[PDB]
């Protein structure tokens, strides 16, 4: 159920190659029997050397076709494995942000590709080995059935006796092994109980009493130990005799066949040679089936885990507004970070809405970035719904610096332009580094814009990382900008470029931005009046009006 064997063209030829290799491998015994009979009746030497030449050509061609079949199958299998790994990673990355919110689950995405890979190559092997030996075993049955029906009937009827009777007998040991293992785990639990209390046991000098207490939970196991050993002995005996006596029976009844004149000695020689082969082929196929059944039964988790806008404008209007804004975590609908909020934004201006709002400010910023759908109310920008515009145009049209910004391990020219739909100009990357003010740190690198950073940003300080992250939005040049949690932790000298951008930058006059940084120096310069906490606003008209009114904005500014 849910197979991905789509290369049915390339795979269909593997079935032709495997059957032809199997038919070609069979030359040795059959031509041994024919040639031996031919010599015993003094047949011609020409047919003898002709037969030898034919059996040599057949067995060499069998080996070559086995190799070509194995190459074609494993090339196909490697392609479908790689494709499946890519598909499951694509599917895991498409899930909603509300599933990823669980920080403790950070290893499950890190583990699903791995157990999917070990499932894939384990199932690849078992499929191959199963299919090879099933085809070999079917050909063996065929040529034995051409050989003599009455001599094969008995070797076909006897297999369930020699394969199931050991399995019936093994249940007695399996039971004794379980009872032994349980008593052993009990005895260990007594030793660990005694070891955990070491200060009291040493105080009372009971350690030779503990040695004997452990000693009795071993002497009580010896009697079961013995039973287990004799039950394995009987299992080994019965599987030995049941398999070994079949070679008496086939020889005896064959002898009778040849006495009756139904077949010659050479046919009996080929039959004795085939029987062992059939027995080994069917014996290996019984070992593979459990491993296949185990591996295939775990794939359903992966398959169900995989199963689990369009408006683009040629120019940006930059207008935005919010009304009755409510937001919450989808996993906790009984509590919300804000409700009933309202706001508006216009080109050439910027506003805070700052205050002791906690995660409610971050959820409002995630709403502006469309990282989750609004839990209550509705909003629109540039005369369109927020989800109505295409994701490629939206991500290029508006951007925000995070509250835990980081750059992935790569070259500086890669980190400063990650997610760009086209290759940025090198002069453009230099201009963005200059406009972000980080170009003084970038020019200090060993390779400038070509310099690679270490994993998780470990090659730079937190202020250097904040300066590098702030450049990414400026390189993308989105009309709407946001940035919080950086300029309050960093020095005002690092925030001086952000202060120039907010105060007088000619480029910022052609765009708009929203402030969520906790730095007080930015809060004094803000154009629009907003301040809030818990979704409740506490300022209006102007930031100067919010101070002069002596209200909650002025009390938090005190």
């Amino acid at each position: 159920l849910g197979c991905l064997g789509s290369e049915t063209r390339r795979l269909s030829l593997f079935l032709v190659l495997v059957v032809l290799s199997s038919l070609g491998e069979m030359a040795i015994p059959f031509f041994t029997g024919r040639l031996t009979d031919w010599i015993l009746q003094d047949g011609s030497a020409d047919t003898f050397t002709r037969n030898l030449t034919l059996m040599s050509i057949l067995t060499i061609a069998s080996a070559v076709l086995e190799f070509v079949g194995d190459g074609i199958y494993n090339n196909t299998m490697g392609h479908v494995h790689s494709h499946l790994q890519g598909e499951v990673f694509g599917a895991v990355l498409r899930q909603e942000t509300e599933f990823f919110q669980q920080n403790q689950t950070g290893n499950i995405m890190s583990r699903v590709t791995e157990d999917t890979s070990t499932l894939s190559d384990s199932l690849s092997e078992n499929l191959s080995l199963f299919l090879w030996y099933l085809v070999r075993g079917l050909c063996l049955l065929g040529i034995m059935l051409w050989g003599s029906v009455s001599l094969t009937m008995v070797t076909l009827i006897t297999l369930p006796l020699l394969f199931l009777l050991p399995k019936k007998v093994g249940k007695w040991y399996q039971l004794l092994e379980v009872q032994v293992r349980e008593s052993l785990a009990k005895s260990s639990q007594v030793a660990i109980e005694a070891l955990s209390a070491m200060p009291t046991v040493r105080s009372f000098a009971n350690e030779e009493g503990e040695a004997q207490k452990f000693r009795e939970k071993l002497q009580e196991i010896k009697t079961l130990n013995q039973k287990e050993a004799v039950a394995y002995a009987v299992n080994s005996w019965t599987t030995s005799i049941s398999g070994m006596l079949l070679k008496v029976g086939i020889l005896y009844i064959g002898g009778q066949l040849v006495t009756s004149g139904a077949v010659s000695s050479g046919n009996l020689v080929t039959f004795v040679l085939y029987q062992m082969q059939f027995t080994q082929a069917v014996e290996v196929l019984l070992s593979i089936y459990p491993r296949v059944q185990k591996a295939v039964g775990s794939s359903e988790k992966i398959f169900e885990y995989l199963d689990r806008g369009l408006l683009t404008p040629l120019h940006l209007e930059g207008l935005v507004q919010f009304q009755d804004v409510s937001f919450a975590y989808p996993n906790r609908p009984d509590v919300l970070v804000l409700q009933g909020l309202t706001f508006t934004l216009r080109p050439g201006e910027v506003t805070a809405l700052v205050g002791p709002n906690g995660s409610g400010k971050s959820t409002v910023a995630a709403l502006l970035q469309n990282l989750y759908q609004p839990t209550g109310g509705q909003l629109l920008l540039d005369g369109k719904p927020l989800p109505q515009y295409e994701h490629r145009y939206l991500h290029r049209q508006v951007a925000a610096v995070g509250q835990e910004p980081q750059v992935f391990g790569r070259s500086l020219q890669e980190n400063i332009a990650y997610g760009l739909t086209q290759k940025p100009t090198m002069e453009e990357i230099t201009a963005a580094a200059v406009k972000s003010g980080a170009h003084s740190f970038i020019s200090g690198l060993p390779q400038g814009y070509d310099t690679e950073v270490d994993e998780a940003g470990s090659q730079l300080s937190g202020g250097q990382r904040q300066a590098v992250a702030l450049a990414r939005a400026l390189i993308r040049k989105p009309c709407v900008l946001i940035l919080d949690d950086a300029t309050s932790a960093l020095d005002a000298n690092s925030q001086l470029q952000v202060e120039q951008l907010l105060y007088e930058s000619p480029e910022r006059y052609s765009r708009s931005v929203l402030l969520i940084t906790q730095h007080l120096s930015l809060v004094e310069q803000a154009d629009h009046i907003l301040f809030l906490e818990g979704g409740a606003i506490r300022e209006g008209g102007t930031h100067q009006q919010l101070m002069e009114k002596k209200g909650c904005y002025w009390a938090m500014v005190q």
Binding site: L129, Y232, T239, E283, V284, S287
Partner: protein, 55 residues
């Protein structure tokens, strides 16, 4: 599929707990002391050959 590692899967010649055929880890160098034993197998086959060459 060496038959000499397959027969111990069955209880005709194997022992309990022997069935898991896995190498210690993915990568691994060969020890020199086991490499010494290959030469002993070759000089054994040489001496056995020269013994049959008398016959």
């Amino acid at each position: 599929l060496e038959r000499a590692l397959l027969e111990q899967q069955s209880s005709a010649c194997g022992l309990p707990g022997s069935s898991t055929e896995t190498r210690p880890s993915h990568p691994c160098p060969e020890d020199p002391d086991v490499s010494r034993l290959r030469l002993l197998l070759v000089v054994l086959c040489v001496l056995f050959g020269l013994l049959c060459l008398l016959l």
